[PDB]
Design a protein around this ligand. Structure first.
Ligand SMILES: Nc1ncnc2c1ncn2[C@@H]1O[C@H](COP(=O)([O-])OC[C@@H](N)Cc2ccc(O)cc2)[C@@H](O)[C@H]1O
Ligand SMILES: Nc1ncnc2c1ncn2[C@@H]1O[C@H](COP(=O)([O-])OC[C@@H](N)Cc2ccc(O)cc2)[C@@H](O)[C@H]1O
Lengths: 317, 317
């Protein structure tokens, strides 16, 4: 209803399976949603914050988030939004990394709330031990090759080339949504733009096994200059303060271009509309002041790292 | 060398991966070959005898056959030579059926020979317990979707439609050839016409994992009238004497059309060339006698059922 309008307004809704459908339910019930995380590194990064912060926002309007760590799938590899086939990582690496991601994840969610506290889960627990035969019959039977072949993630790669391994990724992710629906009452799966195919894939698995649930994608982060967001010359801007220091984190935000700043405040912060509009007026009336740029930077650094870190960054700058 | 020439002559060689390559090895070593059987019913049928009898022939020239029972794959379903998607059978049914097939299989092979006795094996033993993750990474990584999509079995079905389940069948079969190569020194996989794709699939898995082995397909059984061999008005001609009695079996063969008879003697019998040519002359000189028709029928009934059964059929007719 209004949470969906806010998101809309903030510009956090790229697509939704059935908006009137979802808006209805969001307003009538406490909705369990998940979002999936693949240990693709030893740290999450600012590409992951929109989705992370969106969960929070869903939590704050009283809904319950399951941060999902991908111990099994990050063992497979999601072709989505990748032009090339990736390298398969070792179980040990993935295992190692899973533990960290779980840690960064837990900072953004509320585990003490009563009625809607998070859960952080690992699909390795239900993927780990499912036998091949069972997967192909139980899950595979439900998907035609041609449904699968039409996915943006796949269609985008067939001449490029794609391992059968990567080709089946969507099936796992598919399966995830089903276990979470069955065991946790999970009705919404949200994600970034590139994840739409894998979300619907899960809705196709649910419909076909039960015959109820939604999908919402967040747009990928835009730049007015047409360059790739978060891609600095120094390299990725991590969430691990040992990977990217609080000062560096801080400075990244402080260097937001006038063109981006109101979009980023909307995406990454908890300032109200009334506050954001106010900053918009000051960016117009006094853009050398850099009022919106400091508010963004303070707000986000506090979120990720906390006041002391913030206090340090500011004092260091 | 000469075994391959014989087969050639008999007309049992539709295709071979590398004939000079295989001919060489067949003449220089004791070759381990397998042939795969899917419990698709509670009995094998005369569609299966060419392949079965071919193994025997390979055994007789001193080679070692592994009759393979498909407890796992017949749980999946091979699209090959099927225009439509099949129904998935119960584990229990497949399990039940596996036991019978193993029994009919064992009749055609020599288990007492020293140096080249058969083995009857079940891919359920190595497929049964392989986890999904392991399969997609260990086996899937090696095959592009586009290699797979070009297979006769698959390409022949995409508009028709094909479950991902059936789409992956070739991967299992793929895997089979690899375990058998690794654990049994198996270098040749033979099969019927429709199996070429799945054979090569296994050679692609071997090359790519090791960097040696061959594939030979037997033609599907021809009729001069253009109808489907073994398809009677009474229904399938089984190998189970409780499904098709010895008399019925016998009569089926005895009703061979003049057009087929020399081809069938070549395919299903152990008569020499000199003998087959002799019968060819008598079919020419005296075709009302039905000399080739009785020799076929006697020879084959003895093979499948034994003399007493034969004696009965003849006395019953
Ligand atoms: N700039 C950005 N803007 C917005 N979102 C961004 C950006 N960068 C990354 N993301 C997102 O952050 C999440 C990270 O997912 P992933 O590791 O990349 O794979 C995703 C999935 N395969 C993991 C998964 C595994 C199992 C499962 O059940 C569900 C999901 C995704 O929703 C992705 O859309
Ligand atoms: N008229 C006929 N002429 C000649 N051959 C015929 C005829 N009718 C049936 N066959 C053959 O007999 C064998 C029976 O195999 P299948 O049950 O039908 O599936 C075949 C495979 N999916 C089973 C398998 C499973 C696992 C594995 O590793 C290998 C193979 C095959 O080689 C097939 O080609």
């Amino acid at each position: 209803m209004d949470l969906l309008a806010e998101l809309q307004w903030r510009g956090l809704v790229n697509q939704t399976t059935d908006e009137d459908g979802l808006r209805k339910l969001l307003n009538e019930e406490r909705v369990t949603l998940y979002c999936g995380f693949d240990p693709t590194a030893d740290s999450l990064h600012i590409g992951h914050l929109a989705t992370i912060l969106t969960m929070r926002r869903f939590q704050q309007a009283g809904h319950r988030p399951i941060a999902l760590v991908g111990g099994a799938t990050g063992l497979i590899g999601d072709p989505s939004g990748k032009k090339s086939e990736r390298t398969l990582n070792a179980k040990e690496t993935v295992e190692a990394w899973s533990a960290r991601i779980k840690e960064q994840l837990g900072r953004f969610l509320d585990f003490e709330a009563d009625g809607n506290p998070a859960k952080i889960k690992n699909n390795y627990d239900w993927i780990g031990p499912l036998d091949v035969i069972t997967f192909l019959r139980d899950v595979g039977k439900h998907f035609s090759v041609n449904y699968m072949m039409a996915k943006e993630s796949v269609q985008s790669r067939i001449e490029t080339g794609i391992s059968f391994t990567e080709f089946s990724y969507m099936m796992l992710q598919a399966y995830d949504f089903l276990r979470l629906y069955e065991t946790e009452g999970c009705r919404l799966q949200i994600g970034g733009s590139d994840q739409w195919g894998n979300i619907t894939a899960g809705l196709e698995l649910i419909r076909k096994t039960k015959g109820r649930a939604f999908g919402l994608t967040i747009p990928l982060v835009t730049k007015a200059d047409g360059t790739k967001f978060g891609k600095t010359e120094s390299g990725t801007i991590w969430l691990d303060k040992e990977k990217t220091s609080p000062y560096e984190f801080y400075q990244f935000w402080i260097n937001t271009d006038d063109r981006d700043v109101i979009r980023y405040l909307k995406y990454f912060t908890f300032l109200s509309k009334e506050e954001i509009e106010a900053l918009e007026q000051e960016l117009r009336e006094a853009p050398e002041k850099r009022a919106a740029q400091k508010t963004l930077a303070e707000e986000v650094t506090k979120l990720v790292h906390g006041e002391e870190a913030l206090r340090q960054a500011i004092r260091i700058s």
